[PDB]
Design a protein around this ligand. Structure first.
Ligand SMILES: *[C@@H]1O[C@H](CO)[C@@H](O[C@@H]2O[C@H](CO)[C@@H](O[C@@H]3O[C@H](CO[C@H]4O[C@H](CO)[C@@H](O)[C@H](O[C@H]5O[C@H](CO)[C@@H](O)[C@H](O)[C@@H]5O)[C@@H]4O)[C@@H](O)[C@H](O[C@H]4O[C@H](CO)[C@@H](O)[C@H](O)[C@@H]4O[C@H]4O[C@H](CO)[C@@H](O)[C@H](O)[C@@H]4O[C@H]4O[C@H](CO)[C@@H](O)[C@H](O)[C@@H]4O)[C@@H]3O)[C@H](O)[C@H]2NC(C)=O)[C@H](O)[C@H]1NC(C)=O
Ligand SMILES: *[C@@H]1O[C@H](CO)[C@@H](O[C@@H]2O[C@H](CO)[C@@H](O[C@@H]3O[C@H](CO[C@H]4O[C@H](CO)[C@@H](O)[C@H](O)[C@@H]4O)[C@@H](O)[C@H](O[C@H]4O[C@H](CO)[C@@H](O)[C@H](O)[C@@H]4O[C@H]4O[C@H](CO)[C@@H](O)[C@H](O)[C@@H]4O)[C@@H]3O)[C@H](O)[C@H]2NC(C)=O)[C@H](O)[C@H]1NC(C)=O
Ligand SMILES: *[C@@H]1O[C@H](CO)[C@@H](O[C@@H]2O[C@H](CO)[C@@H](O[C@@H]3O[C@H](CO[C@H]4O[C@H](CO)[C@@H](O)[C@H](O)[C@@H]4O)[C@@H](O)[C@H](O[C@H]4O[C@H](CO)[C@@H](O)[C@H](O)[C@@H]4O)[C@@H]3O)[C@H](O)[C@H]2NC(C)=O)[C@H](O)[C@H]1NC(C)=O
Ligand SMILES: *[C@@H]1O[C@H](CO)[C@@H](O[C@@H]2O[C@H](CO)[C@@H](O[C@@H]3O[C@H](CO)[C@@H](O)[C@H](O[C@H]4O[C@H](CO)[C@@H](O)[C@H](O)[C@@H]4O)[C@@H]3O)[C@H](O)[C@H]2NC(C)=O)[C@H](O)[C@H]1NC(C)=O
Ligand SMILES: *[C@@H]1O[C@H](CO)[C@@H](O[C@@H]2O[C@H](CO)[C@@H](O[C@@H]3O[C@H](CO)[C@@H](O)[C@H](O[C@H]4O[C@H](CO)[C@@H](O)[C@H](O)[C@@H]4O)[C@@H]3O)[C@H](O)[C@H]2NC(C)=O)[C@H](O)[C@H]1NC(C)=O
Ligand SMILES: *[C@@H]1O[C@H](CO)[C@@H](O[C@@H]2O[C@H](CO)[C@@H](O[C@@H]3O[C@H](CO)[C@@H](O)[C@H](O[C@H]4O[C@H](CO)[C@@H](O)[C@H](O)[C@@H]4O)[C@@H]3O)[C@H](O)[C@H]2NC(C)=O)[C@H](O)[C@H]1NC(C)=O
Ligand SMILES: *[C@@H]1O[C@H](CO)[C@@H](O[C@@H]2O[C@H](CO)[C@@H](O[C@@H]3O[C@H](CO[C@H]4O[C@H](CO)[C@@H](O)[C@H](O)[C@@H]4O)[C@@H](O)[C@H](O)[C@@H]3O)[C@H](O)[C@H]2NC(C)=O)[C@H](O)[C@H]1NC(C)=O
Ligand SMILES: *[C@@H]1O[C@H](CO)[C@@H](O[C@@H]2O[C@H](CO)[C@@H](O[C@@H]3O[C@H](CO)[C@@H](O)[C@H](O)[C@@H]3O)[C@H](O)[C@H]2NC(C)=O)[C@H](O)[C@H]1NC(C)=O
Ligand SMILES: *[C@@H]1O[C@H](CO)[C@@H](O[C@@H]2O[C@H](CO)[C@@H](O[C@@H]3O[C@H](CO)[C@@H](O)[C@H](O)[C@@H]3O)[C@H](O)[C@H]2NC(C)=O)[C@H](O)[C@H]1NC(C)=O
Ligand SMILES: *[C@@H]1O[C@H](CO)[C@@H](O[C@@H]2O[C@H](CO)[C@@H](O)[C@H](O)[C@H]2NC(C)=O)[C@H](O)[C@H]1NC(C)=O
Ligand SMILES: *[C@@H]1O[C@H](CO)[C@@H](O[C@@H]2O[C@H](CO)[C@@H](O)[C@H](O)[C@H]2NC(C)=O)[C@H](O)[C@H]1NC(C)=O
Ligand SMILES: *[C@@H]1O[C@H](CO)[C@@H](O[C@@H]2O[C@H](CO)[C@@H](O)[C@H](O)[C@H]2NC(C)=O)[C@H](O)[C@H]1NC(C)=O
Ligand SMILES: *[C@@H]1O[C@H](CO)[C@@H](O)[C@H](O)[C@H]1NC(C)=O
Ligand SMILES: *[C@@H]1O[C@H](CO)[C@@H](O)[C@H](O)[C@H]1NC(C)=O
Ligand SMILES: *[C@@H]1O[C@H](CO)[C@@H](O)[C@H](O)[C@H]1NC(C)=O
Lengths: 128, 102, 116, 453, 132, 113, 132, 76
């Protein structure tokens, strides 16, 4: 199986900084990139960034730079190399940022791109 | 940037019928991804690479198209299949077409 | 005797086709190659290609590729050309030559000043 | 005559693509020096010299560097051989111990942080009953604080026992020539303007590949192969942003990197036949290592890569650069090795510019780790030993690895940030010319002749 | 200085040439097809893959009429629905690479027909030397 | 393309003086036989180009005891003791190493005045 | 649904059939005779045992009259003391498994007679092409 | 070795008549003196210098024989 478990929905204040975790399990976590995407009512989807968990090289959306930050935590034991955690510190919170956030992974096929996001977290609702 | 435009908007049909959704891209030459999202649930990848069905996708979902014009056809609708359908190229997204029970 | 008898000057209009003839004499013609060198005063020395009389092999480099077809009549010992839709940059002094297998350029032709 | 008969033909030039293991071979001058000076003095054969690179005409083989093989198996082989050059070496299992560290003798300012610590600790000897108090110098990045007093330990102690590199073996690149076995062939794109995908009009078979020196580098790949005349950028899908943009420029940029410290090593015996090479005293000034490039040549090559990046992105486009967005130390900045010691040398000075549609130098500062965790394994590290004296080296920057940002909402500027990530993008920048095919004889064809009784 | 015919006679030197002209040199491709602490196992399995594939090819020749002739006349007619091309256009137009894609679909029919022809030839020769 | 470079272009050298022409390649000129195939040439206006040297330092029969080729690998250099009126004109480097063949850029020898 | 003749044409499919009927299919047994961290050594020595035994068999053919004919007429008479059976009883009665036990005792005489016959044939052909 | 036989006229004959004449400058010895005087070890040193000419002549002879047989079975 491939599982993505996020944190619970959280209520924040304007000007605060939310940290959302995304625990991934069931595959070699060092291989596949983790994308973050948001869902706003009356605005649709919007992409946030990706992180490659091998070294932690990230790339952010251009209109979210200076606010977002992404880190990861790897599994260092010869018994459970599968699991890992991604994080997203989304800062500079405004009332417009009330949205549901998803952490996604691509498929494993040969003709799968990076953006055909196969596996999805259950979503985390942030209300400011 | 690439601006995706879906034509039908709201599509009101009956169960058992077929359906055809359409999206148009500003820049031609790439693939196209089709997502299904029901009411208040986790989204779901129907189609990647504009014609390939994902895992756990029944063969009534058919993707096609080229250049800028991309077709998503559903044959013999079910009541589960009445949902919102999104088109995605790279990091951009369409505003999603709504499928409604007539 | 040790010669590469070429044609004369060739005043050819653009858009047409251009042939050549290397009516060589003196030695065996299978054992010696035929290559083709350009002279512009701008660049200096340039290439066209090669025809192998023994094996029937022939080639042409990428600038002349798509135009030149190298054939030869082995009995009459005449090389040939088929140039197609040249420019004024192709107006140059051409040279039938010879090589051996792992040899060197023994003989040198006179030079056809094809001016378009 | 119209009754055409079939005839088979054995030994026919016709091929298909294949995936097989290739075979390494290095140059005979590396074989002039003997007995495990570097890796694969025994694992490869000496080359047959002057390899048969013969031209092949009227041929159109489509290449693909991105779904290419032999860059996958080279990335497997160099990792496996990197592990095979660590089994005879010393394990640092007895050195995971409580350290009693203190500041090095140096003028001290509260705002400033020293890059070195002076750590004393107990250590075992040849004799199991006796032990010795011995000190060394460590970097800030190798020690962490465990918690008045101030006592430290090494960082890797809680996850993996570490392996010292043997000081006898070196880390310098020796050029590998990958050779096809019997029944295969290596094709090479001799074309000039070639983005590594689609038809190559001038291919040529070859016995073995040319000199591929293995450099370990994340950004700014070093000592590579220069282009012919242009500056060529290369990607799998440029409109995608998750795929890197391999840049290869024509005239190389010389980089001068140095370490002005004068280290003294110190052999510390751990056990019978066990030597740990620590850092003794600093002799001279405590200084910070750096790298130098020339301002004029770097601004010229940035002008070239802007001129070439505008072929895909419009002429009326602003192109700017930035430093890395973040990550681990050996991906936010470019890592390399210089004479046997690893540098992590900051590149915010190079990649700061913006471009409009119409005897100086740059000093950029480095850092030095002594343990490394290359390719990010689970229980593997390498304690690189210190080396004597002031260290410097000269290298030619050959190419780059870039990354575009996903700019929606009417983005006019298109910023480009460096990023290493996978090591394979280093390796793919040298195997873009090569592919492997399988010779398939036994062609069959009709002609006009009939076998008698 | 090397000459065009010298690199024509190299390995795969006629892959862009016409197959009538490529037929003059088949021994070169047939010759560079056989000869040429953990790594010894990899090179050893590469060498035995090479000799085992060469033996598969020599057996597929050997079950047909020719063991070492390298050019093999045989006795099954070319079904013209396989390629429907003239003779002088294929021996002077196309390469071998261009021909294989034209006959990749119609193959393993031809090999079975060759084996049937050789079995028929062996039983007819057995009967002929039987009545003698 | 194994595109050759000639340095320098022009050489005013008085008659009897010395002259040397350097050439540089982009790859090694070495062929499978071990003999790198470099050919130094002639050119005079109104005449066909002619041989000087057909190998590294193995000159063509018909050359006096002044001309010599030298160098290694990628960098090569001509050597002439005394410059004559027959030794004037344009000189050339050339690779017969492997297809495609390349020439140089031409070197004109003139007289100091 | 598969048919009896389809599994007749499989590997060892005629081992209970008569040897006259088993003679129609010999290429199947001849084909599945060549192709098919520590374990690589075991599979590698199995593969080289297979190809080395195939080469021993092809050499024992090659020192006789036939290199790749797979059915070999030759020129030594059958000494009838070896088997003393009629012709039509052995080509229609017994299998090959039943025949090998009947001729296991009288073997390595036959191979030496074949080598002597081939040496005599080669020297007679040498003399014949010598006087021509 | 079996391929170098197979590219010549004989695959498994082990004694191979062929059709290139012995250039007598190679050894300049009589017939009955070499078939009754010398061993093979003594002969190989006499013909070690003149070899790889003979193999190329054999390959040329076999290529000529195959194209002549192709023409002969072509006109039939
Ligand atoms: C390399 O390996 C080396 C080999 O092991 C290692 O060296 C050893 O390191 C340890 C810890 O650093 C040393 O222990 C300390 O020893 C101090 C020196 O005192 C000795 O010498 C005196 C002569 O000058 C003797 O008189 C004295 O004996 C007396 O004291 C004993 C104490 O238990 C007692 O049992 C005897 O009967 C006798 O009465 C002793 O032999 C010693 O002074 C020190 O105790 C305190 O003193 C320091 C100030 O001088 C404090 O800074 C220090 O932190 C200690 O404080 C303790 O007491 C405080 C008040 O009660 C508490 O608040 C503290 O928390 C702390 O309590 C801890 O320690 C108690 C024992 O003292 C213990 O009972 C508690 O449970 C608690 O754990 C301390 O004993 C040892 O001597 C070193 N040996 C040698 C040969 O050098 C070295 O560190 C390694 N590293 C390096 C870089 O070299
Ligand atoms: C991009 O490509 C360039 C071009 O190669 C490359 O630069 C070269 O890097 C190497 C490795 O850093 C340099 O090699 C070292 O050179 C010094 C200088 O000595 C050489 O040069 C002088 C003058 O040119 C010669 O007279 C002399 O004979 C040498 O050739 C040496 O001190 C180094 O030797 C030590 O390391 C070797 C590693 O194998 C050992 O074999 C050797 O015996 C030495 O080690 C021993 O001695 C030490 C001192 O006593 C001792 O502390 C050790 O423990 C050990 O016992 C080495 O040969 C080379 O000079 C560079 N070339 C130039 C032109 O700068 C770049 O490095 C490359 N870029 C990257 C990122 O790799
Ligand atoms: C990292 O930190 C460690 C901490 O242990 C340092 O190691 C000590 O460093 C100090 C100072 O650098 C050393 O002290 C010096 O030792 C010299 C040699 O010691 C002999 O002589 C003394 C007598 O003084 C004997 O007790 C001893 O047993 C030895 O026989 C002395 O010559 C020095 O004295 C000089 O300086 C003093 C300063 O007060 C003057 O008063 C004297 O007159 C004289 O001029 C001095 O005492 C000490 O020895 C080191 N210890 C060890 C175990 O090596 C490292 O140096 C430090 N490293 C770095 C890079 O910072
Ligand atoms: C990024 O760009 C690269 C190249 O610019 C692009 O790679 C190509 O993707 C296609 C998939 O769209 C790969 O598949 C092939 O496509 C060609 C022509 O499109 C066809 O020959 C094949 O598809 C046909 O056949 C299918 C089944 O029969 C049909 O359903 C279909 O409609 C086609 O008619 C073949 O599958 C192609 O191999 C790659 N090429 C390379 C060099 O990688 C890539 O898709 C782009 N990335 C994204 C995410 O769009
Ligand atoms: C790719 O390059 C190859 C290699 O050069 C090239 O093949 C060549 O094509 C030409 C024709 O286009 C061939 O020339 C002919 O070949 C036939 C082969 O049997 C000969 O019989 C011909 O001889 C006739 O013409 C002579 C004068 O031209 C007459 O004197 C004679 O009596 C005959 O009537 C003629 O030589 C040439 O042999 C081949 N070469 C090889 C090695 O195959 C091919 O055309 C190129 N293709 C592309 C797409 O670029
Ligand atoms: C084990 O099973 C095998 C497999 O079936 C079996 O062998 C069969 O034996 C029968 C006879 O017992 C064979 O039938 C004959 O075979 C000969 C072979 O040449 C034919 O010539 C015969 O033809 C004659 O008879 C025809 C009518 O019956 C006439 O029309 C014709 O003109 C001939 O006069 C006849 O077919 C049969 O072929 C074999 N099959 C095989 C595959 O060998 C064997 O007997 C079984 N043994 C035991 C102990 O159970
Ligand atoms: C083996 O031991 C190593 C040494 O302890 C471990 O390396 C370090 O582990 C810590 C986790 O304990 C990493 O994070 C640090 O955490 C403290 C406290 O965390 C709080 O603050 C951070 C700030 O962002 C917040 O995110 C947390 O949720 C907590 O609220 C901080 O004060 C530090 O600044 C730092 O964030 C270290 O990063 C890590 N070191 C390095 C170099 O990465 C290692 O994890 C251990 N491994 C195993 C397998 O046991
Ligand atoms: C890319 O460039 C930017 C700006 O040139 C760098 O941002 C700067 O980073 C430094 C250190 O990361 C910041 O310094 C401060 O350090 C103290 C140390 O205690 C800390 O308390 C502060 O919170 C802060 O980290 C500096 O403020 C910051 N400047 C800006 C404008 O953001 C960035 O580090 C560069 N990227 C890389 C990978 O080097
Ligand atoms: C040469 O080409 C011709 C093309 O006309 C081939 O004739 C056709 O061959 C196919 C099979 O190869 C025949 O199909 C058969 O149909 C029957 C119908 O019941 C089916 O039971 C068989 O399993 C098979 O599929 C087809 O009928 C036949 N065409 C005609 C008009 O009879 C010919 O076979 C080719 N020759 C060779 C040697 O391949
Ligand atoms: C000795 O080193 C320690 C730490 O290794 C110093 O303590 C702190 O050092 C940091 C930077 O290294 C400063 O920002 C702090 O202000 C220092 N703490 C204090 C209380 O000043 C210490 O200053 C160094 N020097 C001495 C004499 O102990
Ligand atoms: C990198 O270091 C090299 C030295 O190895 C420098 O090259 C020399 O620089 C001096 C200037 O002080 C010149 O006079 C020499 O002619 C140079 N020698 C060579 C062989 O080029 C080089 O300038 C340094 N690069 C930078 C950017 O500082
Ligand atoms: C990137 O380049 C810019 C200029 O191209 C540098 O900007 C300097 O910023 C300081 C402010 O701290 C000013 O005092 C300087 O005058 C600016 N330079 C110029 C030329 O105007 C900037 O420092 C560079 N980035 C880094 C990390 O060094
Ligand atoms: C070969 O046959 C297949 C059908 O089996 C067909 O799809 C293909 O196009 C054919 N190839 C050619 C070259 O006609
Ligand atoms: C074969 O000969 C041996 C004696 O060498 C004898 O014992 C055996 O019975 C014979 N086998 C048959 C089948 O007659
Ligand atoms: C063979 O030829 C070489 C010269 O290539 C000569 O030195 C040698 O003596 C010759 N051998 C015999 C046996 O004549």
């Amino acid at each position: 199986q491939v599982q993505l478990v996020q944190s619970g929905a959280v209520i924040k204040t304007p000007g605060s900084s939310v940290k959302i975790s995304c625990r991934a399990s069931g595959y070699n976590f060092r291989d596949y990139s983790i994308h973050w995407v948001r869902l706003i009512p009356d605005k649709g989807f919007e992409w946030i960034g990706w992180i490659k968990p091998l070294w932690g090289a990230v790339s952010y959306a251009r209109q979210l730079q200076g606010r977002v930050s992404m880190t990861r935590q790897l599994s260092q034991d010869p018994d459970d190399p599968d699991w890992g955690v991604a994080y997203m510190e989304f800062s500079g919170l405004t009332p417009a940022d009330t949205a549901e956030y998803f952490c996604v992974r691509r498929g494993s096929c040969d003709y799968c791109g990076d953006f055909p996001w196969q596996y999805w977290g259950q979503g985390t609702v942030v209300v400011v | 940037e690439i601006v995706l435009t879906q034509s039908p908007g709201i599509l009101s049909l009956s169960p058992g019928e077929t359906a055809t959704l359409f999206c148009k891209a500003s820049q031609g030459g790439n693939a196209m991804t089709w997502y299904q999202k029901r009411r208040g649930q986790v989204p779901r990848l129907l189609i990647y690479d504009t014609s390939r069905r994902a895992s756990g996708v029944p063969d009534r979902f058919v993707g096609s198209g080229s250049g800028t014009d991309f077709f998503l056809t559903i044959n013999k609708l079910d009541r589960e299949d009445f949902a919102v359908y999104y088109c995605q190229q790279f990091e951009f997204f369409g505003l999603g077409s709504e499928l409604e029970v007539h | 005797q040790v010669q590469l008898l070429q044609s004369g000057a060739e005043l050819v209009r653009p858009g047409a086709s251009v042939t050549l003839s290397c009516k060589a004499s003196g030695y065996a013609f299978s054992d010696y190659e035929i290559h083709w060198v350009k002279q512009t005063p701008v660049r200096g020395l340039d290439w066209i290609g090669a025809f192998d009389p023994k094996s029937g092999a022939s080639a042409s480099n990428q600038k002349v590729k798509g135009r030149a077809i190298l054939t030869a009549d082995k009995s009459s010992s005449t090389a040939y050309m088929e140039l197609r839709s040249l420019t004024s940059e192709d107006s140059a002094v051409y040279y039938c030559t010879r090589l051996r297998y792992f040899g060197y350029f023994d003989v040198w032709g006179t030079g056809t000043t094809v001016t378009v | 005559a119209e009754n055409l008969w079939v005839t088979v033909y054995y030994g026919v030039p016709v091929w298909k693509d294949a995936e097989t293991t290739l075979f390494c071979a290095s140059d005979a001058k590396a074989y002039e020096t003997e007995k495990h000076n570097v890796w694969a003095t025994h694992a490869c054969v000496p080359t047959d010299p002057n390899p048969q690179e013969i031209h092949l005409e009227n041929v159109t083989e489509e290449f693909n560097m991105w779904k290419n093989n032999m860059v996958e198996q080279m990335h497997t082989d160099i990792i496996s051989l990197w592990d095979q050059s660590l089994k005879p070496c010393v394990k640092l299992t007895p050195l995971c111990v409580t350290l009693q560290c203190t500041n090095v003798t140096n003028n001290i300012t509260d705002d400033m942080r020293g890059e070195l610590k002076n750590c004393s600790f107990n250590m075992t000897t040849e004799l199991r009953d006796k032990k010795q108090k011995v000190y060394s110098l460590f970097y800030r990045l190798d020690v962490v604080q465990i918690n008045s007093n101030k006592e430290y330990r090494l960082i890797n102690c809680n996850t993996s026992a570490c392996t010292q590199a043997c000081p006898k073996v070196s880390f310098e690149p020796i050029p590998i020539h990958y050779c096809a076995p019997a029944g295969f062939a290596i094709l090479k794109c001799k074309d000039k303007k070639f983005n590594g995908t689609g038809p190559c009009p001038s291919v040529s078979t070859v016995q073995c590949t040319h000199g591929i020196k293995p450099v370990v580098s994340t950004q700014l790949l070093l000592n590579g192969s220069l282009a012919e005349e242009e500056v060529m950028i290369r990607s799998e899908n440029i409109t995608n942003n998750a795929k890197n943009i391999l840049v290869q420029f024509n005239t190389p940029v010389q980089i001068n990197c140095t370490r002005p410290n004068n280290n003294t090593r110190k052999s510390i015996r751990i056990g019978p036949g066990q030597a740990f090479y620590a850092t003794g005293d600093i002799i001279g000034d405590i200084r910070q290592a750096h790298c130098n490039v020339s301002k004029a040549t770097w601004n010229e090559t940035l002008g070239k890569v802007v001129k070439q990046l505008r072929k895909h992105f419009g002429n009326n486009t602003i192109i700017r650069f930035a430093n890395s967005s973040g990550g681990d130390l050996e991906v936010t900045t470019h890592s390399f090795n210089c004479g046997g010691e690893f540098f992590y040398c900051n590149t915010s000075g190079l990649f700061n510019s913006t471009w409009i549609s119409n005897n100086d130098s740059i000093t950029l500062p480095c850092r030095i780790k002594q343990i490394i965790n290359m390719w990010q394994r689970i229980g593997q590290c390498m304690y690189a030993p210190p080396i004597q004296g002031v260290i410097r080296c000269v290298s030619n920057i050959t190419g780059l690895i870039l990354t575009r940002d996903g700019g929606s909402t009417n983005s006019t500027t298109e910023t480009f940030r460096p990023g290493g990530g996978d090591m394979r993008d280093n390796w793919r920048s040298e195997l873009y010319k090569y592919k492997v095919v399988k010779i398939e004889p036994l062609g069959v064809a009709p002609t006009r002749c009939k076998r008698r009784v | 200085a090397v000459g065009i015919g010298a690199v024509f006679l190299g390995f795969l030197g006629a892959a862009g040439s016409t197959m009538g002209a490529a037929s003059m040199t088949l021994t070169v491709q047939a010759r560079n097809l056989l000869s040429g602490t953990v790594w010894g196992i990899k090179q050893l399995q590469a060498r035995v893959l090479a000799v085992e594939r060469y033996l598969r090819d020599q057996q597929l020749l050997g079950i047909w009429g020719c063991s070492g002739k390298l050019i093999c006349c045989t006795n099954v007619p070319w079904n013209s629905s396989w390629s429907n091309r003239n003779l002088s256009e294929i021996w002077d137009n196309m390469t071998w690479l261009q021909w294989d894609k034209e006959i990749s679909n119609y193959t393993q029919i031809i090999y079975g027909l060759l084996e049937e022809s050789q079995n028929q030839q062996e039983k007819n020769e057995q009967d002929l030397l039987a009545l003698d | 393309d194994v595109l050759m470079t000639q340095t320098p272009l022009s050489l005013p050298v008085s008659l009897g003086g010395q002259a040397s022409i350097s050439c540089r390649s982009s790859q090694s000129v070495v062929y499978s036989d071990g003999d790198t195939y470099l050919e130094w040439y002639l050119q005079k206006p109104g005449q066909s180009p002619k041989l000087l040297i057909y190998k590294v330092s193995r000159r063509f029969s018909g050359v006096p005891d002044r001309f010599s080729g030298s160098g290694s690998g990628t960098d090569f250099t001509l050597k002439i003791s005394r410059v004559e009126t027959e030794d004037l004109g344009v000189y050339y480097c050339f690779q017969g190493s492997h297809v495609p063949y390349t020439f140089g850029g031409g070197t004109k020898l003139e007289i100091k005045r």
